[PDB]
Design a protein around this ligand. Structure first.
Ligand SMILES: Nc1n[nH]c2ccccc12
Length: 277
Protein backbone atom coordinates (compact mmCIF):
# COMPACT_ATOMS: atom_id res chain seq x y z
CA UNK A 1 0.00 0.00 0.00
CA UNK A 2 1.10 3.61 -0.78
CA UNK A 3 1.85 6.29 1.82
CA UNK A 4 -1.46 7.40 3.34
CA UNK A 5 -3.16 10.16 1.34
CA UNK A 6 -4.01 13.59 2.71
CA UNK A 7 -6.34 16.56 2.00
CA UNK A 8 -3.63 18.49 0.15
CA UNK A 9 -3.54 15.68 -2.42
CA UNK A 10 -6.96 16.85 -3.54
CA UNK A 11 -8.75 19.71 -5.18
CA UNK A 12 -12.11 19.74 -3.40
CA UNK A 13 -15.22 20.85 -5.26
CA UNK A 14 -18.99 20.66 -4.96
CA UNK A 15 -20.90 19.03 -2.13
CA UNK A 16 -22.51 15.76 -3.27
CA UNK A 17 -24.50 14.97 -0.14
CA UNK A 18 -25.12 16.04 3.44
CA UNK A 19 -26.11 14.01 6.47
CA UNK A 20 -26.19 14.62 10.21
CA UNK A 21 -22.74 13.14 10.75
CA UNK A 22 -21.14 13.49 7.34
CA UNK A 23 -20.74 15.57 4.21
CA UNK A 24 -19.78 14.06 0.87
CA UNK A 25 -17.62 16.28 -1.35
CA UNK A 26 -16.54 15.69 -4.93
CA UNK A 27 -12.75 15.91 -5.09
CA UNK A 28 -10.13 15.59 -7.82
CA UNK A 29 -6.87 13.84 -6.96
CA UNK A 30 -4.03 15.99 -8.33
CA UNK A 31 -1.46 13.30 -9.17
CA UNK A 32 -3.95 11.18 -11.14
CA UNK A 33 -6.75 13.56 -12.18
CA UNK A 34 -9.21 10.98 -10.75
CA UNK A 35 -12.56 12.04 -9.33
CA UNK A 36 -13.49 10.52 -5.95
CA UNK A 37 -16.46 11.22 -3.71
CA UNK A 38 -14.90 11.85 -0.31
CA UNK A 39 -17.14 11.32 2.72
CA UNK A 40 -16.01 13.70 5.47
CA UNK A 41 -16.91 12.97 9.09
CA UNK A 42 -16.14 15.15 12.10
CA UNK A 43 -14.61 13.14 14.94
CA UNK A 44 -15.87 15.38 17.73
CA UNK A 45 -19.43 15.21 16.46
CA UNK A 46 -19.22 11.41 16.16
CA UNK A 47 -17.79 10.87 19.64
CA UNK A 48 -20.14 13.43 21.19
CA UNK A 49 -23.16 11.56 19.78
CA UNK A 50 -22.02 7.97 20.39
CA UNK A 51 -21.70 7.08 16.71
CA UNK A 52 -18.24 5.50 16.73
CA UNK A 53 -19.75 2.04 16.36
CA UNK A 54 -21.75 3.22 13.34
CA UNK A 55 -18.79 4.80 11.58
CA UNK A 56 -16.65 1.78 12.44
CA UNK A 57 -19.30 -0.54 10.97
CA UNK A 58 -19.66 1.53 7.79
CA UNK A 59 -15.94 1.22 7.02
CA UNK A 60 -15.74 -2.46 7.86
CA UNK A 61 -18.73 -3.32 5.65
CA UNK A 62 -17.41 -1.25 2.76
CA UNK A 63 -14.06 -3.02 3.01
CA UNK A 64 -15.82 -6.36 2.50
CA UNK A 65 -17.54 -5.31 -0.73
CA UNK A 66 -16.03 -6.06 -4.12
CA UNK A 67 -18.86 -5.80 -6.61
CA UNK A 68 -19.78 -3.44 -9.50
CA UNK A 69 -23.20 -2.56 -8.02
CA UNK A 70 -21.78 -1.18 -4.81
CA UNK A 71 -19.91 2.01 -3.98
CA UNK A 72 -16.23 1.18 -3.56
CA UNK A 73 -14.06 2.44 -0.72
CA UNK A 74 -10.68 3.25 -2.27
CA UNK A 75 -8.87 4.81 0.70
CA UNK A 76 -9.14 6.42 4.12
CA UNK A 77 -7.12 9.02 5.97
CA UNK A 78 -7.58 11.52 8.77
CA UNK A 79 -6.36 14.82 10.12
CA UNK A 80 -6.93 16.40 13.55
CA UNK A 81 -10.65 17.04 13.26
CA UNK A 82 -11.98 14.81 10.47
CA UNK A 83 -12.13 11.36 8.86
CA UNK A 84 -12.00 10.96 5.07
CA UNK A 85 -13.41 8.05 3.05
CA UNK A 86 -12.50 7.93 -0.63
CA UNK A 87 -15.61 6.56 -2.33
CA UNK A 88 -16.64 5.76 -5.91
CA UNK A 89 -18.19 8.77 -7.64
CA UNK A 90 -21.61 8.14 -9.18
CA UNK A 91 -21.75 10.86 -11.83
CA UNK A 92 -25.48 10.52 -12.60
CA UNK A 93 -26.80 10.90 -9.06
CA UNK A 94 -29.74 9.26 -7.32
CA UNK A 95 -32.32 6.90 -8.81
CA UNK A 96 -34.99 9.04 -7.17
CA UNK A 97 -33.95 11.88 -9.48
CA UNK A 98 -34.86 9.79 -12.52
CA UNK A 99 -38.13 8.61 -11.02
CA UNK A 100 -39.15 12.26 -10.60
CA UNK A 101 -37.66 13.29 -13.93
CA UNK A 102 -39.63 10.83 -16.06
CA UNK A 103 -42.48 10.21 -13.62
CA UNK A 104 -42.44 6.41 -13.71
CA UNK A 105 -40.49 3.66 -15.46
CA UNK A 106 -41.79 1.42 -18.22
CA UNK A 107 -41.57 -2.38 -18.06
CA UNK A 108 -38.14 -2.73 -19.67
CA UNK A 109 -36.41 -0.15 -17.48
CA UNK A 110 -38.23 -1.43 -14.42
CA UNK A 111 -37.23 -5.00 -15.25
CA UNK A 112 -33.59 -4.07 -15.86
CA UNK A 113 -33.05 -1.85 -12.82
CA UNK A 114 -34.98 -4.15 -10.50
CA UNK A 115 -32.84 -7.07 -11.68
CA UNK A 116 -29.66 -5.10 -10.87
CA UNK A 117 -31.00 -4.37 -7.40
CA UNK A 118 -31.94 -8.03 -6.89
CA UNK A 119 -28.51 -9.10 -8.12
CA UNK A 120 -26.85 -6.61 -5.77
CA UNK A 121 -28.90 -7.77 -2.78
CA UNK A 122 -28.02 -11.37 -3.53
CA UNK A 123 -24.35 -10.42 -3.28
CA UNK A 124 -24.81 -8.34 -0.16
CA UNK A 125 -26.86 -11.01 1.58
CA UNK A 126 -24.43 -13.73 0.55
CA UNK A 127 -21.88 -11.94 2.72
CA UNK A 128 -24.24 -11.92 5.70
CA UNK A 129 -24.77 -8.19 5.43
CA UNK A 130 -28.03 -6.28 5.75
CA UNK A 131 -28.44 -2.73 4.42
CA UNK A 132 -31.44 -1.75 6.59
CA UNK A 133 -32.15 1.52 4.81
CA UNK A 134 -32.46 0.67 1.12
CA UNK A 135 -34.26 3.29 -1.00
CA UNK A 136 -33.99 5.21 -4.31
CA UNK A 137 -31.86 7.90 -2.61
CA UNK A 138 -29.26 5.29 -1.64
CA UNK A 139 -29.25 3.78 -5.13
CA UNK A 140 -26.91 5.87 -7.23
CA UNK A 141 -26.39 5.76 -10.97
CA UNK A 142 -22.95 5.53 -12.49
CA UNK A 143 -21.73 7.42 -15.55
CA UNK A 144 -22.74 4.40 -17.62
CA UNK A 145 -26.14 4.28 -15.90
CA UNK A 146 -25.60 1.09 -13.88
CA UNK A 147 -26.57 1.23 -10.18
CA UNK A 148 -24.16 1.77 -7.31
CA UNK A 149 -25.67 1.16 -3.90
CA UNK A 150 -24.35 3.35 -1.10
CA UNK A 151 -24.75 4.50 2.52
CA UNK A 152 -23.73 1.57 4.71
CA UNK A 153 -23.59 3.51 7.96
CA UNK A 154 -26.85 1.91 9.08
CA UNK A 155 -25.86 -1.58 7.87
CA UNK A 156 -25.59 -4.62 10.13
CA UNK A 157 -23.37 -7.68 9.77
CA UNK A 158 -25.11 -10.84 10.96
CA UNK A 159 -23.66 -12.90 13.82
CA UNK A 160 -31.76 -0.92 17.40
CA UNK A 161 -32.18 1.67 14.64
CA UNK A 162 -35.03 2.57 12.28
CA UNK A 163 -34.60 3.40 8.58
CA UNK A 164 -36.62 5.76 6.37
CA UNK A 165 -40.31 5.65 7.29
CA UNK A 166 -41.79 4.70 3.91
CA UNK A 167 -39.45 1.71 3.45
CA UNK A 168 -39.59 0.37 7.03
CA UNK A 169 -40.72 -3.25 7.30
CA UNK A 170 -43.54 -4.38 9.61
CA UNK A 171 -41.25 -6.42 11.84
CA UNK A 172 -39.18 -3.34 12.69
CA UNK A 173 -42.30 -1.59 14.00
CA UNK A 174 -43.34 -4.64 16.00
CA UNK A 175 -40.12 -6.27 17.27
CA UNK A 176 -37.14 -3.91 16.86
CA UNK A 177 -35.53 -6.78 14.94
CA UNK A 178 -34.36 -6.89 11.32
CA UNK A 179 -33.04 -9.45 8.84
CA UNK A 180 -32.42 -10.01 5.13
CA UNK A 181 -36.18 -9.90 4.57
CA UNK A 182 -36.21 -6.24 5.63
CA UNK A 183 -34.22 -5.36 2.52
CA UNK A 184 -36.61 -7.51 0.49
CA UNK A 185 -39.54 -5.61 1.93
CA UNK A 186 -37.75 -2.41 0.95
CA UNK A 187 -37.29 -3.93 -2.51
CA UNK A 188 -41.03 -4.41 -3.00
CA UNK A 189 -41.55 -0.76 -2.10
CA UNK A 190 -38.92 0.36 -4.63
CA UNK A 191 -40.37 -1.83 -7.38
CA UNK A 192 -43.86 -0.48 -6.68
CA UNK A 193 -42.32 3.00 -6.83
CA UNK A 194 -40.60 2.45 -10.18
CA UNK A 195 -43.87 1.33 -11.78
CA UNK A 196 -46.30 3.66 -10.02
CA UNK A 197 -44.13 6.73 -9.49
CA UNK A 198 -44.71 6.82 -5.73
CA UNK A 199 -43.97 4.60 -2.70
CA UNK A 200 -46.75 2.16 -1.68
CA UNK A 201 -47.32 3.62 1.80
CA UNK A 202 -47.92 7.38 1.97
CA UNK A 203 -49.57 9.59 4.59
CA UNK A 204 -49.61 12.93 6.39
CA UNK A 205 -46.94 11.93 8.90
CA UNK A 206 -44.65 9.15 10.11
CA UNK A 207 -47.20 7.72 12.53
CA UNK A 208 -49.89 7.38 9.87
CA UNK A 209 -47.37 5.68 7.60
CA UNK A 210 -46.39 3.16 10.23
CA UNK A 211 -50.08 2.44 10.69
CA UNK A 212 -50.58 1.61 7.02
CA UNK A 213 -47.44 -0.53 6.91
CA UNK A 214 -48.49 -2.91 9.69
CA UNK A 215 -52.03 -2.90 8.30
CA UNK A 216 -50.61 -3.62 4.85
CA UNK A 217 -52.77 -0.74 3.65
CA UNK A 218 -51.84 0.13 0.06
CA UNK A 219 -53.08 -0.72 -3.42
CA UNK A 220 -52.05 -0.90 -7.07
CA UNK A 221 -52.90 1.62 -9.82
CA UNK A 222 -55.04 0.34 -12.69
CA UNK A 223 -52.15 0.18 -15.16
CA UNK A 224 -49.57 -1.60 -12.97
CA UNK A 225 -47.70 -4.28 -14.94
CA UNK A 226 -49.45 -7.54 -13.90
CA UNK A 227 -46.28 -9.63 -13.52
CA UNK A 228 -44.61 -6.84 -11.53
CA UNK A 229 -47.67 -6.59 -9.31
CA UNK A 230 -47.52 -10.30 -8.61
CA UNK A 231 -43.86 -9.94 -7.67
CA UNK A 232 -44.63 -7.03 -5.35
CA UNK A 233 -47.42 -8.99 -3.67
CA UNK A 234 -44.87 -11.74 -2.94
CA UNK A 235 -42.47 -9.24 -1.31
CA UNK A 236 -44.83 -6.97 0.62
CA UNK A 237 -45.85 -9.78 2.94
CA UNK A 238 -46.25 -9.08 6.66
CA UNK A 239 -44.81 -12.40 7.75
CA UNK A 240 -41.14 -11.84 6.94
CA UNK A 241 -40.59 -15.60 6.53
CA UNK A 242 -42.87 -15.72 3.50
CA UNK A 243 -41.11 -13.02 1.46
CA UNK A 244 -39.80 -14.11 -1.93
CA UNK A 245 -36.02 -14.19 -1.65
CA UNK A 246 -35.51 -14.99 2.03
CA UNK A 247 -34.02 -18.21 3.43
CA UNK A 248 -37.31 -19.86 4.42
CA UNK A 249 -38.47 -19.42 0.84
CA UNK A 250 -35.19 -20.96 -0.36
CA UNK A 251 -33.40 -17.77 -1.31
CA UNK A 252 -32.66 -15.98 -4.55
CA UNK A 253 -33.27 -18.82 -6.97
CA UNK A 254 -37.05 -18.64 -6.76
CA UNK A 255 -36.94 -14.81 -6.73
CA UNK A 256 -34.70 -14.55 -9.81
CA UNK A 257 -36.97 -17.13 -11.46
CA UNK A 258 -40.11 -15.00 -11.13
CA UNK A 259 -41.96 -14.52 -14.44
CA UNK A 260 -41.42 -10.76 -14.19
CA UNK A 261 -37.74 -11.43 -14.86
CA UNK A 262 -38.34 -13.89 -17.68
CA UNK A 263 -36.09 -12.15 -20.20
CA UNK A 264 -33.33 -11.29 -17.71
CA UNK A 265 -29.84 -12.74 -18.13
CA UNK A 266 -28.55 -12.70 -14.56
CA UNK A 267 -24.89 -13.60 -15.12
CA UNK A 268 -23.56 -10.38 -16.69
CA UNK A 269 -26.03 -7.57 -15.91
CA UNK A 270 -23.17 -5.16 -15.30
CA UNK A 271 -21.89 -5.88 -18.82
CA UNK A 272 -25.20 -5.06 -20.53
CA UNK A 273 -26.35 -1.73 -21.94
CA UNK A 274 -29.16 -0.27 -19.80
CA UNK A 275 -32.41 0.71 -21.53
CA UNK A 276 -32.57 4.46 -22.24
CA UNK A 277 -34.69 6.51 -19.84
N1 LIG B 1 -22.47 11.13 -6.14
C1 LIG B 1 -21.84 10.23 -5.35
N2 LIG B 1 -20.89 9.37 -5.73
N3 LIG B 1 -20.59 8.70 -4.61
C2 LIG B 1 -21.30 9.09 -3.52
C3 LIG B 1 -21.26 8.63 -2.22
C4 LIG B 1 -22.13 9.27 -1.37
C5 LIG B 1 -22.97 10.29 -1.79
C6 LIG B 1 -22.99 10.73 -3.09
C7 LIG B 1 -22.12 10.10 -3.97
Amino acid sequence: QPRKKRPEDFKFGKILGEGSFSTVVLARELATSREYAIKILEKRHIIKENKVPYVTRERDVMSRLDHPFFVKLYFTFQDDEKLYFGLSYAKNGELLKYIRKIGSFDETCTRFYTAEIVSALEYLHGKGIIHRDLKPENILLNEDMHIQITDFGTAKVLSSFVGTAQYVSPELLTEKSACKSSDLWALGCIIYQLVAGLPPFRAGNEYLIFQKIIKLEYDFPEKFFPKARDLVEKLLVLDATKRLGCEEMEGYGPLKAHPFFESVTWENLHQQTPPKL
